Amino acid sequence: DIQMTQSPSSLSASVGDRVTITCRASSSVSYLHWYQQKPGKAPKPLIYAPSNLASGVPSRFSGSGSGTDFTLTISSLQPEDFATYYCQQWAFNPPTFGQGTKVEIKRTVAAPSVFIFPPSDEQLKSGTASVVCLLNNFYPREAKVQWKVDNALQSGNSQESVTEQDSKDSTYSLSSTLTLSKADYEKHKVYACEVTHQGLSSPVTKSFNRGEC
Amino acid sequence: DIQMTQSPASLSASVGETVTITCRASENIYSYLAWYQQKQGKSPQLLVYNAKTLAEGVPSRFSGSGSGTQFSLKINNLQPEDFGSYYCQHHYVTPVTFGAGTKLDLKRTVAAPSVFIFPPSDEQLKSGTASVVCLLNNFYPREAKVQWKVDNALQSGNSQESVTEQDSKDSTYSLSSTLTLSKADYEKHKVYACEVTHQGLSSPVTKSFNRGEC
Amino acid sequence: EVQLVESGGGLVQPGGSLRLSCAASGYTFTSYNMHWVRQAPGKGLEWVGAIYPGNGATSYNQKFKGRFTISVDKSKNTLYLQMNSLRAEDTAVYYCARVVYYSASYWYFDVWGQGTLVTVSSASTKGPSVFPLAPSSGGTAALGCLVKDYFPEPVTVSWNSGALTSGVHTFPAVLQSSGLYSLSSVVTVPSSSLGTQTYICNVNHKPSNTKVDKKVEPK
Amino acid sequence: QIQLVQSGPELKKPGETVKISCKASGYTFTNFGMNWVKQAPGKGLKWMGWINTYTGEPTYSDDFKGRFALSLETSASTAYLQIDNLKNEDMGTYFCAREGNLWGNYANWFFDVWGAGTTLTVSSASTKGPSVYPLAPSALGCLVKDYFPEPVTVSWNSALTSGVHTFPAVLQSSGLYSLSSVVTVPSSSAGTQSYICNVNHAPSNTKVDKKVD
């Protein structure tokens, strides 16, 4: 078969930037295709050989290249251009794609809005307690979330989940769920969530005392 | 499952010379075969994958050829840091299987060992044991004969040898031989000798000592 | 409008079998070649095979010739993928895509379907537990739903049956230590719209036929 | 900065159970499958099994079923190898290896990244600390003798990286290990500075400093 070695693996750029993605073929081909896969959706046709733009595709997308080295050029990057881009070869059997190039939007630093959610009384009945901490609409992606339970730092009992960059405001959202047994949870008073972020001059902490509505 | 047969068991080649390692599979594995280099003590490192593709950082002098049943690894412009064992492995289907391996000995030019002999320490002898050590420093080739003589008597089955890994700098080995007798045994003999036989010297050299501190 | 709808994804034990369906509407089914392309999560796109509905002529990827088989039911406009002797590495989102030749030799994947997730696992199907994330005293407050303990994916969460969309984040599922998936869906709303405006999350886990509607209330 | 950090060496008794860890960093953990490979003095390089990091579904070799279990904790980005009802045939180093196929899942099993390895020794004998003996001449050396298990770490003054030769350990009739570490000096008037060998046998919490005269 034919390997589409795509470059780079990922990249970030500000709105208005000129973004170039390289793809490289193991054998000489005449043209490549390009596809745009938005998160949680199928690949969408972006450019088809030689360089015709697919339906809905704006004029800011162009495909160039000759021997084995081809390029996708986004002339002016927009917030909704965040996606994985795939080059495709079509001359040979089987058809092969590149591994993908993830494109992030780079915007001004945005601080997270931190919310804490105690375990619902409905859940405690099941015999398990899940404390959820929420970090909302922030940039960049990098953020540290630490669990304090009665001033003790928690390890190996919480999970994080990150939202894919928003298409409008180019921001992320983070959740962290501390998970205890009703028994263990019933043994402590203060549940804290210490958020550390770049756009946050001092770490923010949201807390509650077990059953304090 | 698939069987990986690798030739040769071990080889030797000088700096600069081109080297080739062959690996063939019991079944057809198309293009799905990888190559690793390991310097035991350390974890294996990937060199080639998909039969022909090089990994990140692996020097351009490494090349992978082959498809189907027959595959080959070739190293151009050999280096000191190219010492060690090499493994082939198919990444076709579960279960993955590895090769027996191939050991790479470089070639320096014949080198003389720096032979030293060490009598038992007083403290060890005070604990009731006597371990006589014989050092064979930086030399080439590897193959070496080490015999222990005690008052001109050949020592049988009481010696143990330990050979160092080849140097990534000067490409030389070292060998340590220990004659392990007891305090009682060691105190009734005087001359303790270590007879070294090596390709890089005419007559077999012997280093010895009289019992104790003198 | 050309529409490709896929079905038959879900849980399968290793060694097991499955058959995926692609239902094509809005165009002349027999006039276009149909393909199957799979995508393991976090990775790239892998071509499986293709069939010409017009005469049933197939073409497969060398790596799937044997275990995978494509077929057509012309009268139902349906394309099928038969996956046999499945292995753990076969977990992926399977897409059917239409192909158009616009010139001699020149062809491209012009229309893609929504894709079904086939998940190869020895685990059993488990329905999701749904707990509320009560809001509770800037000019806005946060509230949500905890979609805990379920297998396999996916789960769909909508707010007020699609009436609430803006400011809704539905986090990626996370495989817990328990070996069961869990996720959360959150929404930020005006603080004044609490106590008067009612909010409900709608969780659907098709692999277990679970439909839960959860009214989220402050206390 | 992409690596697999494993777990300290283990000494275990037959029948007992061991659980090796393999913490990944510098990449998205749940996008690459994790494998395990067993190497035993001489044989070496036997693939045991791999685990899909999206589902958590393990797959074992026929030679590693029953008392062997693969698992992971995705929050900790860690894969675990647990061996039950241990057997001395289970001696050897267990590596955790990553799969480096970014394009798809069809051939993964070229492992571009490896862990350092975890050496397991099994047996009943208990931990014996070493006895260090000087090798003075008239080419200094130390004889760290009668220890179990491995490993043992020898250095010289902690800052003497000359022509040092720490030989491989040797299993004696005793069942204990013996080792000799020799260092070459100016082989002349070098008898002016202080020459110490630092010997640390972690399993016995024994650290001895012997200043060969």
CA distance A171 to A113: 12
Residue ranges of alpha helices (H) inside chain A are 121-126, 182-185
Among residues D146, D183, D148, the alpha carbon closest in space to that of D166 is found at D183
| C104 and C138 housed in the same domain | no
Among residues C107, C113, C118, the alpha carbon closest in space to that of C25 is found at C113
Q: Could you tell me if A99 lies within 8 Å of chain D, comparing CB atoms?
A: yes
> A140: cis peptide before it, omega within 30°?
yes
Please report, to the nearest 10 degrees, the dihedral formed by the alpha carbons of residues C193, C194, C196, C202 taken in order.
100
CA distance B164 to B162: 7
Chain C residue numbers touching A33 (CB-CB < 8 A)? 108-109
Q: Could you tell me if B137 lies within 8 Å of chain D, comparing CB atoms?
A: yes
Contact criterion met (CB below 8 Å) for C72 and C55: no
Taking every pair of C-alpha atoms in chain D, what is the biggest distance, in angstroms? 66
CA distance B89 to B98: 4
Could you say which DSSP state residue D193 is in? S
Phi first, then psi, for residue D202 (nearest 5°) are: -50, -45
Burial of D178 (0-12, 13-18, 19+ CB in 10 A): buried
CA distance A4 to A97: 6
Could you say which DSSP state residue D168 is in? P
Three-state secondary structure string covering chain C? CCEEEEECCEEECCCCCEEEEEEEECCCHHHCEEEEEEECCCCCCEEEEEEECCCCEEEECCCCECCEEEEEEHHHCEEEEEECCCCHHHCEEEEEEEEEECCCCCEEEEEECCCEEEEECCCCCECCEEEEECCCCCCEEEEEEEEEEEECCCCEEEECCCCECCCEEECCCEECCCCCEEEEEEEEEEHHHECCECCEEEEEEHHHCEEEEEECCCC
**Count of C-beta atoms within a 10 Å radius of residue C111:** 22
- Tokens 């200094």, residue located: D140
CA distance D136 to A93: 72
Q: Give rounded-to-5 percent helix, strand, coil for chain D.
A: 5, 45, 50
Could you say which DSSP state residue D169 is in? P
Method for this entry: X-ray
Looking from the CA of B205 toward its CB, the CA atoms found within 13 Å total 16
- Tokens 């069942």, residue located: D175
| C97 and C164 housed in the same domain | no
Residues with Cβ within 8 Å of C174's Cβ and at least 6 positions away in sequence, in order, are A159, A160, A161, C181, C182, C183, D74, D75
| C136 and C102 housed in the same domain | no
| C79 and C3 housed in the same domain | yes
> D151: cis peptide before it, omega within 30°?
yes
Residue ranges of alpha helices (H) inside D109-169 are none
Chain C residue numbers touching B90 (CB-CB < 8 A)? none
Q: Which two tokens stand for residue A78?
A: 């927009």
Is C177's CB within 8 Å of D101's CB? no
Contact criterion met (CB below 8 Å) for C4 and C19: no
Could you say which DSSP state residue A185 is in? H
Chain C residue numbers touching B93 (CB-CB < 8 A)? 87
Q: What is the CA C200 to chain-centroid distance, rounded?
A: 23
CATH number of the domain that C155 lies in? 2.60.40.10
Q: A107-210 sits in which CATH class?
A: mainly beta
| C135 and C105 housed in the same domain | no
| C99 and C191 housed in the same domain | no
Q: Is D191 helix (H, G, I), strand (E, B) or coil?
A: coil
Closest CA–CA distance from residue D14 to any residue of chain C (Å): 28
Contact criterion met (CB below 8 Å) for C145 and C134: no
CA distance B193 to D21: 49
Residue ranges of alpha helices (H) inside D22-156 are none
Chain A residue numbers touching D75 (CB-CB < 8 A)? 156, 158-160
Q: Could you tell me if C44 lies within 8 Å of chain D, comparing CB atoms?
A: yes
Q: Is B60 helix (H, G, I), strand (E, B) or coil?
A: coil
Q: What strand order describes the sheet that includes A172-181?
A: A113-117, A128-138, A172-181, A158-162
Q: Could you tell me if C172 lies within 8 Å of chain D, comparing CB atoms?
A: no
- Chains touching A (3+ CB pairs < 8 Å): B, C, D
Among residues B104, B86, B97, the alpha carbon closest in space to that of B38 is found at B86
Specify the resolution in Å: 3.0
CA distance A134 to A195: 10
Closest CA–CA distance from residue A17 to any residue of chain C (Å): 26
Nearest CB to A134; choose among C59, C173, C186: C186
A66-71, long-range: CB < 8 A, 24+ apart: A67/A28, A68/A24, A68/A25, A68/A26, A68/A27, A68/A28, A68/A29, A69/A22, A69/A23, A69/A24, A70/A22, A70/A23, A70/A24, A70/A25, A70/A31, A70/A32, A71/A20, A71/A21, A71/A22, A71/A23
Is C183's CB within 8 Å of A161's CB? yes
CA distance C115 to C95: 5
Would strands A33-37 and A44-48 be described as parallel, antiparallel, or unpaired?
antiparallel
For chains A and B, count residue pairs whose Cβ atoms are closer than 8 Å: 3
Is D102's CB within 8 Å of A99's CB? yes
Q: Which two tokens stand for residue C94?
A: 């399977």
Structural domain range at position C186: 123-219
The H or E element containing residue A144 is strand A143-149
CA distance B35 to D110: 9
The domains spanning D1-124 and D125-213 adopt the same CATH topology: yes
Residue ranges of alpha helices (H) inside A83-207 are 121-126, 182-185
Q: What is the CA B13 to chain-centroid distance, rounded?
A: 14
Q: Span D125-213: which CATH code?
A: 2.60.40.10
**Count of C-beta atoms within a 10 Å radius of residue C211:** 11
**Count of C-beta atoms within a 10 Å radius of residue C195:** 10
Closest CA–CA distance from residue A74 to any residue of chain B (Å): 28
Q: Which two tokens stand for residue A17?
A: 């930037």
Length of chain B in residues, anyone?
A: 214
Residues in chain C whose Cβ is within 8 Å of chain B: 62, 87-89
Closest CA–CA distance from residue C113 to any residue of chain A (Å): 7
Chain C residue numbers touching D28 (CB-CB < 8 A)? 42
Q: Is A178 helix (H, G, I), strand (E, B) or coil?
A: strand
Bridge partners (DSSP) listed for residue C145? C132, C185
CA distance B23 to B68: 11
Q: Would you kindly state where each structural domain of chain A is located, as residue ranges?
A: 1-106, 107-210
Phi-psi region of A21 (alpha: psi -120 to 50; beta: other; left: phi over 0): beta
DSSP codes, B197-209: E-TTSSSPEEEEE
Q: Could you tell me if D75 lies within 8 Å of chain A, comparing CB atoms?
A: yes
Which of C105, C122, C139 is the C-terminal boundary of a domain?
A: C122
The amino acid sitting at D64 is F
Q: Could you tell me if B53 lies within 8 Å of chain A, comparing CB atoms?
A: yes
Closest CA–CA distance from residue B75 to any residue of chain D (Å): 19
**Count of C-beta atoms within a 10 Å radius of residue D71:** 15
| C38 and C143 housed in the same domain | no
Q: What is the Cα gyration radius of chain C?
A: 21
Three-state secondary structure string covering B110-174? CECCEEEEECCCHHHHHCCEEEEEEEEEEEECCCCEEEEEECCCECCCCEEEEECCCCCCCCCEE
Length of chain C in residues, anyone?
A: 219
Q: Quick one: A1-106 is in which CATH superfamily?
A: Immunoglobulins (2.60.40.10)
Interface test with B, best of D22, D109, D164, D172 (most B CBs within 10 A): D109
Name the domain count of chain C. 2
Bridge partners (DSSP) listed for residue C32? none
Is B94's CB within 8 Å of C62's CB? no
Is D46's CB within 8 Å of B138's CB? no
Bridge partners (DSSP) listed for residue A132? A117, A177
The H or E element containing residue D160 is none
Is B94's CB within 8 Å of C87's CB? yes
Chain A residue numbers touching D76 (CB-CB < 8 A)? 156
Q: Span D1-124: which CATH code?
A: 2.60.40.10
Contact criterion met (CB below 8 Å) for A73 and A62: yes
| C131 and C203 housed in the same domain | yes
Q: Could you tell me if B162 lies within 8 Å of chain C, comparing CB atoms?
A: no
Residue of C nearest to D53 (CA): C175
Q: Would you kindly state where each structural domain of chain D is located, as residue ranges?
A: 1-124, 125-213
Residues with Cβ within 8 Å of B160's Cβ and at least 6 positions away in sequence, in order, are B177, B178, B180, D170, D172, D178
Q: Which two tokens stand for residue D171?
A: 């299993």
The answer as to CATH 3.40.50.300 being correct for domain B110-214 is no
**Count of C-beta atoms within a 10 Å radius of residue C79:** 26
Residues with Cβ within 8 Å of D193's Cβ and at least 6 positions away in sequence, in order, are none
The domains spanning A1-106 and A107-210 adopt the same CATH topology: yes
Q: Which two tokens stand for residue B42?
A: 């350390």
Is D74's CB within 8 Å of A159's CB? yes
Interface test with C, best of D29, D57, D77, D80 (most C CBs within 10 A): D57
| C11 and C76 housed in the same domain | yes
Is B94's CB within 8 Å of C89's CB? yes
Q: Could you tell me if B28 lies within 8 Å of chain D, comparing CB atoms?
A: no
CA distance A103 to A86: 11
Length of chain D in residues, anyone?
A: 213
Nearest CB to C131; choose among A33, A122, A175: A122
Closest CA–CA distance from residue B185 to any residue of chain D (Å): 18
Among residues B127, B70, B81, the alpha carbon closest in space to that of B104 is found at B81
> D149: cis peptide before it, omega within 30°?
yes
| C117 and C128 housed in the same domain | no
CA distance A15 to A81: 10
Is B133's CB within 8 Å of D143's CB? yes
Q: Measure Cα distances from B102 to A177, B53, B83, D101, D123 in Å.
A: 50, 21, 11, 26, 31
Q: Is B11 helix (H, G, I), strand (E, B) or coil?
A: strand
Residue ranges of alpha helices (H) inside A46-178 are 121-126
CA distance D121 to A157: 31
Looking from the CA of B149 toward its CB, the CA atoms found within 13 Å total 14
CATH architecture of B1-109: Sandwich (2.60)
Closest CA–CA distance from residue B13 to any residue of chain D (Å): 23
Q: Give rounded-to-5 percent helix, strand, coil for chain A.
A: 5, 50, 40
**Count of C-beta atoms within a 10 Å radius of residue D25:** 11
Q: Which two tokens stand for residue B112?
A: 């003389």
Among residues A86, D103, A87, A43, the alpha carbon closest in space to that of C98 is found at A43
Would strands C3-7 and C18-25 be described as parallel, antiparallel, or unpaired?
antiparallel
Three-state secondary structure string covering C139-159? CEEEEEEEEEEEECCCCEEEE
Q: Which two tokens stand for residue C203?
A: 């969780």
